[PDB]
Design a protein around this ligand. Structure first.
Ligand SMILES: [Cl-]
Lengths: 153, 43, 152, 43
C-alpha cells in the first residue's frame, strides 16, 4: 500500500484533485490544509486523522508521523510533483533555506499549482525528506516551498 | 468533505531527472496558522 | 483538454480504474469494452458516445474517431502505459504482427494489467497510432496487444 | 453507472525510454465480438 497518492474530492460533475499524500508503514501523510482533518475514503476503507499540526501544516492518518529522512543541507533533492490533471514528474534541485528567528528549514524553488501540496521531496535513497506545498510567493511572483517534515514519535 | 485518495505511483528517485530552480536564501516568519511571510503560500 | 485520461468508476473505497482513453480535438477515444457505450462523467459534464465498433473494440465520445496515424511497419513505437494505481510510463518497443487471414496488424509484446486498456501507442512524432489493450495471451502466459486504430 | 474520466497527463514521446518486448509473428483470428484468437485478450 506504500506509494504516493492523489487526494481527490467528489464533485457534482466528476472529481477534482485537492492535494497529494504519502503512504508509508500503514500511515498516510499529507498537508493539514489539504484535508483539514477530514476523513478519507480509500482502498482500506475510511481513514481518520491520528496526529495533526496546523502550524507545521501536517496531518497523519491511521498512525503517528512516520517520515523521518532529513535534507543533508548540501545535497540535491528531487520533487516528485503530482499536479492535478498532470503526470507525476521528478524535478531535481539544490534547495535553498528559509531563515526563521527560531531555526533553519530547507526550501525548494519549484512552482506547481494548487493541488500539488503534499507531493514528496526525496533524497538519493528515495526517502521522503519532506512534503511540498507550504511556502511563500516571492516578489517576482514565483513560488518557493519549504521542505516540511514532521517530528516522528 | 467527501474526499478520497487514489494511488498515483511508486516513490522513487529518478536518475538524471530535469534539474531546475534556484537556491534561495529568505528571511521568513511562520504564524500559528501555518502561513509563511516575507521579511497564498499553500498550494 | 487534449491528453491521456484514466477511465475511473466511483466506489465506496474511493475509485477504481477500468480503462484509459485519449482526448484529441474534443473527442474522447477509448476501447469499447472499457465503457461499453456508457456515458462518462467529466469536468465538462456528461460525455456521450458518438461512434462505436464492437469488433474493433473502439468507441468515440462527443464526435467521430479522430486518430489516424498508422504504424509504418518498420520503426519502433512507444506505449504510454497508464496502469491502475501506477505511474504513467513510456515503453519503447519494435512491434510484431498479428497475421490475420484478413490482413496484417502491428502488435506490441508489452504486458499490463486490466485497466490499462486504451493507453495510447505513439510514433516517433508523438501521434497516437493506436490504442493498447485488445489482443491475445500467448501460451507462456504473456500478453500481446494489437495496435488498434480506427478509421478517421 | 458512475463512470468518469480524469486527465492523467500530456501525450509525448520520451527520449531515451526503456526498450522492452519482442516482435512476435502470430497467426490470429478475430471474431464478431472483437475477441482475438490464436491459430481474455481484453485488458
Ligand atoms: Cl503519472
Amino acid at each position: 500500500t506504500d506509494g504516493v497518492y492523489r487526494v481527490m474530492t467528489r464533485r457534482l460533475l466528476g472529481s477534482t484533485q485537492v492535494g497529494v499524500g504519502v503512504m508509508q508503514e500503514g500511515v498516510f501523510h499529507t498537508m493539514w490544509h489539504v484535508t483539514k482533518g477530514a476523513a478519507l475514503r480509500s482502498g482500506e476503507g475510511r481513514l481518520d486523522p491520528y496526529w495533526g499540526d496546523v502550524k507545521q501544516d501536517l496531518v497523519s492518518y491511521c498512525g503517528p508521523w512516520k517520515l523521518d529522512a532529513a535534507w543533508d543541507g548540501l545535497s540535491e533533492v528531487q520533487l516528485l510533483a503530482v499536479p492535478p490533471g498532470e503526470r507525476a514528474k521528478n524535478i531535481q534541485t539544490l534547495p535553498g533555506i528559509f531563515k526563521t528567528k527560531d531555526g533553519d528549514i530547507g526550501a525548494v524553488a519549484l512552482d506547481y499549482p494548487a493541488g500539488t501540496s503534499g507531493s514528496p521531496i526525496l533524497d538519493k535513497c528515495g526517502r521522503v525528506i519532506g512534503l511540498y506545498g507550504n511556502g511563500v510567493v516571492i516578489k517576482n511572483g514565483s513560488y518557493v516551498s519549504a521542505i516540511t517534515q514532521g517530528k516522528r514519535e | 468533505v467527501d474526499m478520497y485518495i487514489e494511488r498515483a505511483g511508486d516513490i522513487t528517485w529518478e536518475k538524471d531527472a530535469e534539474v531546475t530552480g534556484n537556491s534561495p536564501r529568505l528571511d521568513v516568519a511562520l504564524d500559528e496558522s501555518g502561513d509563511f511571510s516575507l521579511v497564498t503560500g499553500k498550494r
